[PDB]
DNA sequence: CCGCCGC
RNA sequence: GCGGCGG
């Protein structure tokens, strides 16, 4: 029935759904009243409108209706307006300008222009508006006593002057009203009244002008004519005169058209839109230019235009602009096609862009902010309902909608436009909508950022020798907290208490609970684990699951081996524990998680549970053999008077029981073991030493090895059962050290297994630190060793030194060749110390605690020995430039006052270096997640066989040659990956697809050895087809584990992990972490190398201010400028491919991808990443850097449209999909063509397809703009997203691939066939 | 980087 | 948010 969640969709909100979500309508601001905390109803608490306020209330939503609309903040203000785009309004002013209603907008037609032409949509002045929209009639009064200078309704032209000191400022018609005065060629008082209109013709018997008395009154007279001029004042018409001789029309008053009949029959007709007046004052009918017309205002205005914009026509409109123009127009309506588009496309349509309904949010989520706001909102919403039903004045029904259209954006976006300030208390931008939503502590950034969890801990960490990786020290008394609730229901399990409350109140004073509480808790921790955390959280190992192991006091005992995968000393680091709640989540974290399971490093191969120090320590000294004095001849080789004699010699104090002595020193004829036991106990006797060289008796062999070297034997052999594959992976030929261990390891992990592994390190372990006790090693000043010969070597270099001296004492040396010299001079000489420190252990104290350390992986640096008991020498000055003098002192003897004082200098660089490269913060760490945190492992061993060849040789450093590369790198490459193609080398057939384990990679390097060999076929990331995902094929080896990676792997983080750690370590050319920055982020580096884009030969122009270095062959050569100063190393001569080094240096990943290619862009990024890694030491699998460079170039830019227009750049799989289903499915190929594009790491991520993703680095604004126009809808895959959802994550026990796993037993597997 | 201690 | 210490 129930569904999980698959899918989620953003889209625009239907006013009718905003009431279908809706309970209730907030009608009123009442927030708080006093007498009854009980909420005041209908404002906002009511409980009908969200549900009961007693013991699913927090969840439901009210709607306050608007009177006139008001638009989303969030969709007018967004860098490109949604809505101004769309429209084509002006796009960022225009909209402003009436969004608020001031404004004008217009309609369906004028035909008249003010100048121009009717504006379809376009918006004009009230002023003008109402003067020719409906007309303007416009007055100009006058003077009293003053004549006018034109008549009744004499046509005027606009400035001219009415009179002294009136003019006019409109041509068309100008009224004048009353005749003060009139002229006759052959004075009208108030009560008179001219019958004769515009100078028209008279005879003597006729009336002109009356009035009240009959009496003098004007009479016509021999031929008079008219010239009226004294008007009381002047109206002037925005109109056109039409006289007329005989009748009329409808009336004055009406709208007339061109061509509608005015008078006169069909003769006089109108020319414009207007009313009439059908004035007989002049026998005339003039049309005011005022015809009617529609528009309307605000975000009213734009609800309209919304409304009737037929995208369809747009789109059409847009496709032939956008083709055809020339770049300029074309691009613009490419922008404008795209939210169009998404429109249509996803249904949910545009005219919702409209707010005419505010949601409210529930009452229980906001407990204060966004209430004040909500309040404004309200009040005038309402106070507006009132305004429109009481009495209707213009001036303040606008004056109160642009309040409210400032209200609605408020609660919406804050800021955007003025900021709301809760009055006098504190200028602080209530916090709105959208800023609940964005910024570094938002909403969306909530759900990722972390935060503190329940059952959690923290204490000292104690070294816990006895402890087997498998557990971990964990203090009762925490324990007793931590698992508190597990503990209580134990308690009613058992007698101790009766109920749960009882059993708290029982631990809230008591002071022990003495073993029945005790006897308990041990009990409900029986099988469950705990996680421990390490303070920098770094890698996956950070945090490893142990079952606790309940002990006293305070410190938390952890295991000495995991002490390497933690970075955690005894110092006084603190690590915290966590608890597994869900009986799944203890599975996962005791199955997958617990130390003892996690023995290899998800970085290289290599393990991580290797042996440290006191352990090796151990172990080596009672693996050595000890040699002696060889008082004489050493021929046993042969003489059996020589077993007899030299063994009486040994009797004696002649031949010592370890002399050189070839076959067998007198040690290995006087004792002869028969079972391995008998060995030992002659030791525990006190007969033989353990570094003893004695003869053994073993299971088929007569062996020449000391007890100790057995011991060793038997202890791994006990670790494993299978005592025969114990000693077929170890070798009791040499003393073991910590690599000898560290090898012993892994192939115990290849060959047995991962725990029975784990065993065999607790015994390690176990021995080693034993052992490590008795052996009886310790410091002592004397331990440090001076050599005899370093009086010698500094003699023979400080006359050397004089030599030098006198040398340029007579002017033979340049002032910088003699100080060169001298380094050299102390270069040599301290190295020799060196060697002879050593040289001295070896010969005559190979038991030296010092050195043993040293040598062992125990402890100790060949170059800190040297500080001890040779001499550290040179140390630099505080630039740089290293001392001319050297510290010809060692720590054992007194280093002096200045020579310590001078190597201070760079004790103190070291240490600068330290921090600003520490507190870097795992930076990269950060980034590389922020591009990898989306990929995992979901698949069926992808199709597309696109693979990558490793190479196995390197080319120039000394010039052209090819070399093997080293063998650390080659395994780097190949070590766990899955051969593309099967390659038969030396013999053997290595299949298509096997995994090449490490032997596997050891025989391809001794076969390019040989020549057989030049790269390598093999799966890998950069080439995987599945879309969001990579392969098992593609991944490969690599795994906690070794056997092939499991489907379902959060393989992005583990390659983000591998990289950043570190980061932490790597502080003309330029390197380093900025090296690495400037590597995953496709940069132009400091110094640039110039490639060559064309591939032929090589030819250069000496000296001149400038060199030329010519790519030149069938016709044309590209120029590449090398200034004086650049240093090039390609020659007048041969070839060059594409993207060859042609200056000295680094090189920029644009250029090199346009001239040789992608596949070219992708293997330098590795390699020259690698490139910092290897000789900072860091030893970690190309896989990873794979699989981030990959992102790099997942998107690509189109140049050959089909669906969107060619200025795009689109995630590259989703044109493959595109491209093949356009030439498959359905036909006509469109072809796709595109363009790699090398995006880097940072913008990869920044514009990552899933908008859940993006709200939450960037600006959550546009991305939810923008996603919310296209109802976009996130496919829930990536590890951030569906953190979000707080879903179970995609990968790991999430992967799709088996969060869906069923259990059943056969007696109701039988028993379902039973209910069938 | 995480943990604390204080105006 | 300022200052001090620890890993
Ligand atoms: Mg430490
Ligand atoms: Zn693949």
Same mark, same amino acid.
């Given at each position: 029935?129930?569904?999980?969640?698959?899918?989620?969709?953003?889209?625009?909100?239907?006013?009718?759904?905003?009431?279908?979500?809706?309970?209730?309508?907030?009608?009123?601001?009442?927030?708080?009243?006093?007498?009854?905390?009980?909420?005041?109803?209908?404002?906002?608490?009511?409980? &009908?409108?969200?549900?009961?306020?007693?013991?699913?209330?927090?969840?439901?939503?009210?709607?306050?209706?608007?009177?006139?609309?008001?638009?989303?903040?969030?969709?007018?203000?967004?860098?490109?307006?949604?809505?101004?785009?769309?429209?084509?309004?002006?796009?960022?002013?225009?909209?402003?300008?009436?969004?608020?209603?001031?404004?004008?907008?217009?309609?369906?037609?004028?035909?008249?222009?003010? +100048?121009?032409?009717?504006?379809?949509?376009?918006?004009?002045?009230?002023?003008?508006? #109402?003067?020719?929209?409906?007309?303007?009639?416009?007055?100009?009064?006058?003077? %009293?006593?003053?004549?006018?200078?034109?008549?009744?309704?004499?046509?005027?032209?606009?400035?001219?002057?009415?009179?002294?000191?009136?003019?006019?400022?409109?041509?068309?018609?100008?009224?004048? &009203?009353?005749?003060?005065?009139?002229?006759?060629?052959?004075?009208?008082?108030?009560?008179?009244?001219?019958?004769?209109?515009? +100078?028209?013709?008279?005879?003597?018997?006729?009336?002109?002008?009356?009035?009240?008395?009959?009496? !003098?009154?004007?009479?016509?007279?021999?031929?008079?004519?008219?010239?009226?001029?004294?008007?009381?004042?002047?109206?002037?018409?925005?109109?056109?005169?039409?006289?007329?001789?005989?009748?009329?029309?409808?009336?004055?008053?009406?709208?007339?058209?061109?061509?509608?009949?005015?008078?006169?029959?069909?003769?006089?007709?109108?020319?414009?839109?207007?009313?009439?007046?059908?004035?007989?004052?002049?026998?005339?009918?003039?049309?005011?230019?005022?015809?009617?017309?529609? /528009? &309307?205002? +605000?975000?009213?205005?734009?609800?309209?235009?919304?409304?009737?914009?037929?995208?369809?026509?747009?789109?059409?409109?847009?496709? !032939?602009?956008?083709?055809?123009?020339?770049?300029?127009?074309?691009?613009?309506?490419?922008?404008?096609?795209?939210?169009?588009?998404?429109?249509?496309?996803?249904?949910?349509?545009?005219?919702?862009?409209?707010?005419?309904?505010?949601?409210?949010?529930?009452?229980?989520?906001?407990?204060?902010?966004?209430?004040?706001?909500?309040?404004?909102?309200?009040?005038?919403?309402?106070?507006?309902?009132?305004?429109?039903?009481?009495?209707?004045?213009?001036?303040?029904?606008?004056?109160?909608?642009?309040?409210?259209?400032?209200?609605?954006?408020?609660?919406?976006?804050?800021?955007?436009?003025?900021?709301?300030?809760?009055?006098?208390?504190?200028?602080?931008?209530?916090?709105?909508?959208?800023?609940?939503?964005?910024?570094?502590?938002?909403?969306?950034?909530?759900?990722?950022?972390?935060?503190?969890?329940?059952?959690?801990?923290?204490?000292?960490?104690?070294?816990?020798?006895?402890?087997?990786?498998?557990?971990?020290?964990?203090?009762?008394?925490?324990?007793?907290?931590?698992?508190?609730?597990?503990?209580?229901?134990?308690?009613?399990?058992? +007698?101790?208490?009766?109920?749960?409350?009882?059993?708290?109140?029982?631990?809230?004073?008591?002071?022990?609970?003495?073993?029945?509480?005790?006897?308990?808790? *041990?009990?409900?921790?029986?099988?469950?684990?705990?996680?421990?955390?390490?303070?920098?959280?770094?890698?996956?190992?950070?945090?490893?699951?142990?079952?606790?192991?309940?002990?006293?006091?305070?410190?938390?005992?952890?295991? %000495?081996?995991?002490?390497?995968?933690?970075?955690?000393?005894?110092?006084?680091?603190?690590?915290?524990?966590?608890?597994?709640?869900?009986?799944?989540?203890?599975?996962?974290?005791?199955?997958?998680?617990?130390?003892?399971?996690?023995?290899?490093? =998800?970085?290289?191969?290599?393990?991580?549970?290797?042996?440290?120090?006191?352990?090796?320590?151990?172990?080596?000294?009672?693996?050595?053999?000890?040699?002696?004095?060889?008082?004489?001849?050493?021929?046993?080789?042969?003489?059996?008077? /020589?077993?007899?004699?030299?063994?009486?010699?040994?009797?004696?104090?002649?031949?010592?029981?370890?002399?050189?002595?070839?076959?067998?020193?007198?040690?290995?004829?006087?004792?002869?073991?028969?079972?391995?036991?008998?060995?030992?106990?002659? $030791?525990?006797?006190?007969?033989?030493?353990?570094?003893?060289?004695?003869?053994?008796?073993?299971?088929?062999?007569?062996?020449?090895?000391? =007890?100790?070297?057995?011991?060793?034997?038997?202890?791994?052999?006990?670790?494993?059962?299978?005592?025969?594959?114990?000693?077929?992976?170890?070798?009791?030929?040499?003393?073991?050290?910590?690599?000898?261990?560290?090898?012993?390891?892994?192939?115990?992990?290849?060959?047995?297994?991962?725990?029975?592994?784990?065993?065999?390190?607790?015994?390690?372990?176990?021995?080693?630190?034993?052992?490590?006790?008795?052996?009886?090693?310790?410091?002592?000043?004397?331990?440090?060793?001076?050599?005899?010969?370093?009086?010698?070597?500094?003699?023979?270099?400080?006359?050397?030194?004089?030599?030098?001296?006198?040398?340029?004492?007579?002017? @033979?040396?340049?002032?910088?060749?003699?100080?060169?010299?001298?380094?050299?001079?102390?270069?040599?000489?301290?190295?020799k110390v060196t060697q002879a420190v050593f040289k001295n252990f070896e010969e005559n104290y190979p038991f030296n605690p010092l050195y043993v350390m040293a040598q062992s992986g125990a402890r100790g640096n060949p170059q800190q020995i040297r500080q001890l008991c040779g001499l550290r020498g040179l140390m630099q000055k505080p630039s740089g430039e290293t001392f001319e003098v050297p510290v010809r002192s060692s720590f054992r003897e007194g280093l002096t006052v200045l020579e310590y004082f001078i190597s201070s200098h760079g004790a103190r660089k070291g240490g600068a270096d330290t921090?600003?490269?520490?507190?870097?913060?795992?930076?990269?760490?950060?980034?590389?997640?922020?591009?990898?945190?989306?990929?995992? $492992?979901?698949?069926?061993?992808?199709?597309?066989?696109?693979?990558?060849?490793?190479?196995? @040789?390197?080319?120039?450093?000394?010039?052209?040659?090819?070399?093997? #590369?080293?063998?650390?790198?080659? *395994?780097?490459?190949?070590?766990?990956?899955?051969?593309?193609?099967?390659?038969?080398?030396?013999?053997?057939?290595?299949?298509?697809?096997?995994?090449?384990?490490?032997?596997?990679?050891?025989?391809?390097?001794?076969?390019?050895?040989?020549?057989?060999?030049?790269?390598? %076929?093999?799966?890998?990331?950069?080439?995987?087809?599945?879309?969001?995902?990579?392969?098992?094929?593609?991944?490969?080896?690599?795994?906690?584990?070794?056997?092939?990676?499991?489907?379902?792997?959060?393989?992005?983080?583990?390659? /983000?992990?591998?990289?950043?750690?570190?980061?932490?370590?790597?502080?003309?050319?330029?390197?380093?972490?900025?090296?690495?920055?400037?590597?995953? *982020?496709?940069?132009?580096?400091?110094?640039?190398?110039?490639?060559?884009?064309?591939?032929?030969?090589?030819?250069?122009? !000496?000296?001149?201010?400038?060199?030329?270095?010519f790519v030149e062959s069938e016709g044309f050569s590209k120029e590449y400028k090398l200034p004086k100063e650049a240093r090039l190393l390609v020659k007048d001569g041969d070839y060059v491919e594409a993207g060859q080094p042609l200056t000295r240096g680094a090189i920029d990943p644009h250029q090199l991808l346009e001239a040789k290619g992608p596949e070219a862009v992708e293997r330098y990024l590795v390699e020259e990443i690698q490139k910092v890694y290897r000789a900072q030491g860091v030893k970690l699998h190309d896989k990873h850097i794979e699989i981030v460079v990959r992102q790099m170039?997942?998107?690509? *830019?189109?140049?050959? =449209?089909?669906?969107?227009?060619?200025?795009?750049?689109?995630?590259?799989?989703?044109?493959?999909?595109?491209?093949?289903?356009?030439?498959?499915?359905?036909?006509?190929?469109?072809?796709?063509?595109?363009?790699?594009?090398?995006?880097?790491?940072?913008?990869?991520?920044?514009?990552?397809?899933?908008?859940?993703?993006?709200?939450?680095?960037?600006?959550?604004?546009?991305?939810?703009?923008?996603?919310?126009?296209?109802?976009?809808?996130?496919?829930?895959?990536?590890?951030?997203?569906?953190?979000?959802?707080?879903?179970?994550?995609?990968?790991?026990?999430?992967?799709? @691939?088996?969060?869906?796993?069923?259990?059943?037993?056969?007696?109701?597997?039988?028993?379902?066939?039973?209910?069938?």
């Open positions: 029935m129930k569904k999980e969640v698959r899918k989620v969709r953003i889209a625009l909100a239907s006013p009718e759904k905003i009431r279908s979500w809706s309970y209730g309508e907030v009608e009123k601001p009442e927030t708080i009243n006093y007498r009854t905390l009980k909420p005041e109803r209908d404002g906002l608490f009511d409980e &009908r409108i969200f549900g009961p306020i007693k013991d699913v209330r927090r969840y439901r939503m009210g709607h306050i209706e608007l009177a006139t609309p008001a638009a989303h903040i969030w969709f007018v203000k967004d860098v490109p307006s949604k809505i101004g785009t769309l429209l084509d309004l002006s796009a960022t002013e225009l909209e402003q300008v009436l969004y608020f209603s001031k404004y004008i907008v217009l309609d369906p037609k004028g035909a008249i222009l003010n +100048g121009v032409p009717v504006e379809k949509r376009q918006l004009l002045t009230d002023e003008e508006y #109402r003067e020719l929209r409906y007309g303007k009639q416009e007055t100009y009064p006058l003077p %009293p006593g003053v004549d006018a200078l034109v008549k009744d309704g004499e046509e005027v032209v606009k400035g001219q002057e009415l009179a002294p000191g009136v003019v006019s400022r409109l041509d068309g018609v100008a009224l004048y &009203r009353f005749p003060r005065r009139v002229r006759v060629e052959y004075r009208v008082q108030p009560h008179m009244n001219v019958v004769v209109p515009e +100078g028209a013709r008279v005879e003597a018997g006729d009336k002109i002008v009356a009035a009240i008395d009959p009496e !003098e009154e004007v009479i016509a007279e021999a031929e008079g004519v008219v010239h009226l001029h004294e008007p009381a004042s002047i109206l002037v018409v925005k109109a056109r005169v039409y006289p007329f001789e005989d009748d009329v029309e409808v009336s004055t008053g009406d709208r007339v058209a061109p061509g509608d009949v005015l008078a006169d029959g069909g003769k006089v007709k109108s020319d414009v839109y207007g009313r009439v007046e059908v004035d007989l004052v002049r026998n005339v009918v003039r049309v005011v230019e005022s015809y009617d017309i529609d /528009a &309307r205002m +605000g975000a009213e205005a734009i609800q309209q235009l919304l409304k009737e914009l037929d995208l369809e026509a747009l789109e059409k409109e847009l496709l !032939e602009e956008m083709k055809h123009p020339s770049r300029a127009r074309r691009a613009k309506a490419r922008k404008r096609l795209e939210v169009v588009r998404a429109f249509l496309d996803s249904g949910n349509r545009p005219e919702w862009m409209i707010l005419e309904a505010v949601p409210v949010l529930p009452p229980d989520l906001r407990p204060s902010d966004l209430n004040d706001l909500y309040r404004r909102l309200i009040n005038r919403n309402n106070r507006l309902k009132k305004l429109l039903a009481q009495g209707a004045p213009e001036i303040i029904i606008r004056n109160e909608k642009r309040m409210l259209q400032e209200a609605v954006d408020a609660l919406l976006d804050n800021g955007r436009r003025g900021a709301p300030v809760t009055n006098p208390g504190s200028d602080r931008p209530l916090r709105s909508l959208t800023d609940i939503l964005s910024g570094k502590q938002g909403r969306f950034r909530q759900n990722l950022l972390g935060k503190r969890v329940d059952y959690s801990g923290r204490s000292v960490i104690v070294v816990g020798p006895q402890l087997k990786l498998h557990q971990c020290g964990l203090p009762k008394r925490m324990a007793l907290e931590l698992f508190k609730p597990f503990l209580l229901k134990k308690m009613e399990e058992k +007698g101790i208490a009766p109920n749960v409350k009882a059993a708290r109140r029982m631990l809230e004073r008591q002071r022990d609970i003495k073993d029945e509480v005790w006897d308990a808790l *041990e009990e409900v921790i029986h099988g469950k684990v705990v996680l421990l955390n390490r303070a920098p959280t770094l890698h996956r190992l950070g945090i490893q699951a142990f079952q606790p192991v309940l002990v006293e006091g305070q410190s938390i005992q952890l295991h %000495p081996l995991v002490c390497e995968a933690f970075n955690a000393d005894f110092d006084g680091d603190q690590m915290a524990v966590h608890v597994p709640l869900s009986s799944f989540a203890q599975a996962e974290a005791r199955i997958q998680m617990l130390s003892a399971h996690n023995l290899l490093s =998800p970085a290289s191969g290599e393990p991580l549970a290797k042996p440290s120090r006191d352990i090796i320590l151990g172990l080596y000294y009672i693996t050595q053999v000890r040699k002696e004095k060889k008082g004489a001849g050493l021929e046993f080789a042969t003489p059996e008077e /020589a077993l007899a004699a030299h063994e009486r010699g040994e009797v004696a104090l002649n031949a010592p029981i370890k002399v050189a002595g070839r076959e067998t020193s007198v040690g290995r004829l006087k004792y002869v073991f028969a079972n391995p036991d008998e060995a030992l106990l002659a $030791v525990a006797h006190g007969i033989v030493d353990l570094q003893d060289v004695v003869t053994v008796r073993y299971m088929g062999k007569r062996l020449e090895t000391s =007890p100790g070297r057995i011991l060793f034997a038997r202890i791994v052999a006990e670790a494993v059962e299978d005592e025969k594959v114990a000693w077929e992976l170890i070798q009791l030929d040499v003393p073991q050290e910590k690599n000898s261990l560290k090898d012993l390891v892994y192939q115990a992990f290849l060959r047995l297994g991962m725990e029975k592994t784990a065993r065999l390190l607790d015994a390690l372990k176990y021995y080693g630190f034993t052992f490590s006790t008795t052996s009886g090693i310790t410091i002592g000043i004397d331990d440090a060793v001076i050599p005899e010969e370093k009086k010698q070597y500094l003699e023979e270099a400080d006359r050397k030194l004089l030599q030098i001296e006198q040398a340029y004492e007579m002017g @033979f040396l340049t002032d910088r060749e003699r100080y060169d010299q001298i380094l050299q001079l102390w270069t040599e000489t301290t190295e921090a600003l490269r520490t507190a870097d913060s795992g930076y990269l760490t950060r980034k590389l997640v922020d591009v990898t945190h989306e990929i995992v $492992v979901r698949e069926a061993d992808c199709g597309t066989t696109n693979y990558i060849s490793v190479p196995l @040789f390197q080319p120039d450093e000394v010039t052209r040659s090819l070399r093997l #590369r080293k063998r650390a790198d080659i *395994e780097a490459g190949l070590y766990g990956r899955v051969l593309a193609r099967e390659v038969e080398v030396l013999g053997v057939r290595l299949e298509e697809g096997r995994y090449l384990s490490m032997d596997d990679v050891h025989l391809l390097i001794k076969a390019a050895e040989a020549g057989e060999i030049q790269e390598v %076929p093999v799966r890998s990331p950069l080439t995987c087809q599945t879309r969001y995902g990579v392969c098992q094929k593609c991944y490969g080896y690599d795994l906690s584990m070794a056997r092939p990676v499991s489907i379902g792997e959060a393989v992005g983080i583990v390659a /983000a992990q591998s990289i950043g750690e570190p980061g932490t370590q790597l502080t003309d050319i330029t390197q380093g972490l900025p090296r690495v920055i400037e590597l995953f *982020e496709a940069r132009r580096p400091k110094a640039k190398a110039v490639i060559s884009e064309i591939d032929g030969v090589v030819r250069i122009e !000496e000296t001149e201010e400038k060199l030329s270095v170039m997942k998107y690509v *830019e189109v140049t050959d =449209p089909g669906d969107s227009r060619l200025l795009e750049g689109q995630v590259l799989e989703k044109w493959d999909v595109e491209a093949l289903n356009e030439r498959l499915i359905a036909e006509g190929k469109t072809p796709v063509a595109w363009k790699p594009l090398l995006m880097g790491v940072t913008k990869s991520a920044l514009s990552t397809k899933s908008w859940l993703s993006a709200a939450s680095f960037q600006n959550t604004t546009h991305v939810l703009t923008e996603a919310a126009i296209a109802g976009k809808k996130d496919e829930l895959i990536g590890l951030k997203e569906n953190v979000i959802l707080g879903r179970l994550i995609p990968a790991g026990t999430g992967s799709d @691939f088996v969060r869906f796993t069923q259990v059943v037993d056969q007696k109701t597997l039988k028993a379902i066939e039973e209910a069938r």
